[model samples]
Target: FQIPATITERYKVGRTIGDGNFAVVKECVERSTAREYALKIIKKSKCRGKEHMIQNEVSILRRVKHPNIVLLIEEMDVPTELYLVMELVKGGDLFDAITSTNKYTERDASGMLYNLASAIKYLHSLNIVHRDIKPENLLVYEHQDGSKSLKLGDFGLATIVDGPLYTVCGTPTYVAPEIIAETGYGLKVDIWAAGVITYILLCGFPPFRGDQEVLFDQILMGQVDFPSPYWDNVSDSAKELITMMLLVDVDQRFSAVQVLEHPWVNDDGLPENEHQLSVAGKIKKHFTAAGVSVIATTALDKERQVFRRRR
Candidate 1:
């Protein structure tokens, strides 16, 4: 690896992969094996007292271990900043994957859900909770052979909770009712977000959506529905599973294990969904408004990397 000219390091920093207001991601290379990674760098001055948030991400990655979850290779401390070496997912995130094709199959969507559910189940099993579980945080492998594998990335909002947390940190569209109520919440919130993701995977938009307050109002009411046209041909099994996940009452919602065990998730033959291709077209339009990443994904193996963000 060609070391950065300014610093003494074993890894070489290349061009920036992603740019944002507070952080930048770069493609880094290891000299030993020629391995590649997405090195996320954040200014310590920008973070200052918010260091705990970065530590929280590091702690979560160190504690949680799963194939579907992104891996943390290591961390480095610079003179004025901090760098996190993470797993490089060249295929882009779930949003990119979905928007690229304009639509995906129920069979394929369910497979991705199963992988996500399995990862969440593992997290909950370890007494950890991923506070922000959404499509933007999910990644798809860019494989040369065309085999697709959906993996979960980003643990910035994750926490190792002993009980309930009152923090309102998840995305508005996927936030749970308890979070909106400001009541303490547990691991079930992830299930709710997963439900939202599943709904969009089947359709193209969220179950309850509008602008700002209107969206939160609908979510707070905890009313979820499957309208005609979009959901017309969707299987009853799929809807039943979604109902179990998106319930307003936490006590009524299905747990990660329960989701993994659902017949819709286990069945190889997916139900009829005549609107998939059309939904794909809509998602593609949304993609045009958003952005697209270059194609580069590969088969995932036992190896892994990390996706921790500095606040």
Candidate 2:
């Protein structure tokens, strides 16, 4: 890896596009090619002793090269900060794009599911488990003809599968049962999250609900419901795939390859509907509330809170 002194010499840093706890993503233009990119500026000092997490993300991003996975164009390790020049995926996040259009169907959801599962399959084959997989982390890139592609980003929570990982991690809503049950978990956790995302794509809300504690309890119990009205028009095959992935038994869960092989995702027979999904309003409200509680923040908070209280 080339640890350059400065990134500013090669790229003109523009406005801030995104921000997180320790890093901020800004728009930048490559002077050489005149191409645009998202510049992720991470403060080494602000990592708060979790520098390895950023290092893991950097190394993983460099190693993986796939269309559905976000690309790390280049990197610069300045004295105080680490700079990651990322591909600028123009269309915002998955949820925002899904809610933007009035035309949503089972076919549309299946396309997204296929792309995501394909990406996850690639990662798992390399023994990389993306512990966090949620709508916010899934970005959309709009093409010339208005076609959009789903790309998975944010690898801070990702780790290679060396052995059975015992750490309780991942967002409360998308977390698999094994994580909460304190059982050793592996790649299936990502499949579980993909299942949850598929459920939300067909409908607007998550399968599990309530405060963090109650949510964890529901996850452990693994009681999923397809409530009336919302799930009325959804394909049974889709539901079957979700059920297979959401199994509390880790051994019984479907792998990414199996998910791709499922009829709903593999075939083009998904009937298109004239009726636009009406769940956008509910999705908007749910995401708004989730944004309010830093306590309810999607990643690591549940783990952070528990450790704080236990000690």
Candidate 3:
């Protein structure tokens, strides 16, 4: 089934944000407030046999409420489609940001990494594993104060695991060794993807890049090559943290919370709270330099234009 021509006579479809085999995102307006929202429209026919996927996404989204995680406001079912009313994040996915800019400064990368870690930690606390954590699924927004914020999106591939989940899922570039081995993997897989993201942010590319077969081999072998540019600019502490989190053995890998408290994140400072005020100040200055607007509407409009042209 497909979505109706209009939703509740309120949200008018503006344009296609993205469209894949099974889903499409449309720019929409909320009649009551005339506020914009990203409407993720999925055809029920496509989900007929995969109802669990739809249900899982809704359940996971409803349970997760963190600033770094995309907000899901409501779910609506029409005869033809299921619509997930989500917070409209203007900045395109991380992939687009990196490609357009070519690279990111250490501070900019680190700030985003910190935000992602916080989000992952929150998800782990709830026993949820975002199996498909990759650049395409990580969304960014420029705040009014000019600071950039990240919101992890697309929970369709996420799964709720009581203990460990044994399944090969996730993009090839970001998949972990355990996942490739078909071993019982846990949330640590996301950490491996996080390491890949960190690697890409530092080197302007992923650590494992090749044909699918070769990429799979490299991932299964746990081969991570730190090239010249990465080694020259990346700090030892950051490398150590990435290595620890990307360990092939899920048991040996650091937990999401542990990663957040790692030296790279905390800088061996007093405590998180003690340094938060200072960090906030630095972030404010950095955002100003980045030219991100703090106001909501302007920032959203900027984000929409960026993604619309690029994607």
State which candidate has the highest TM-score. 2
How much is 22 displaced in model 3, in angstroms? 3.2
Global lDDT of model 3: 0.67
Q: Give the TM-score of candidate 3.
A: 0.77
TM-score leaderboard ranking: 2, 1, 3
Task: Write down the RMSD of all candidates, one decimal each.
Answer: 7.3, 4.4, 9.5
Q: Hey, what RMSD does candidate 1 come out at?
A: 7.3
lDDT of 1 by residue, 1-311 (tens): 23344433677777877755456677778767788877766666766776777667777777777878777777777668667677776666776666565446677778889989999999999878887777767877656887567767767677888887876677777888888777799999999999999988888778887556667678777677889877887888999999899988898899999998899997767544344634665455543111111111111101112111222
> lDDT of candidate 2 vs native?
0.77
Off by over 4 Å in 1: 1-10, 20-22, 78-80, 271-277, 284-311
lDDT (CA) for every model shown? 0.72, 0.77, 0.67
State residue 49's C-alpha deviation in candidate 3, in Å. Answer: 3.2
Question: Clash totals for all models, in order?
Answer: 11, 0, 8
For residues 147-167, could you state the per-residue lDDT of candidate 2 as single tens digits?
777888767678899999988
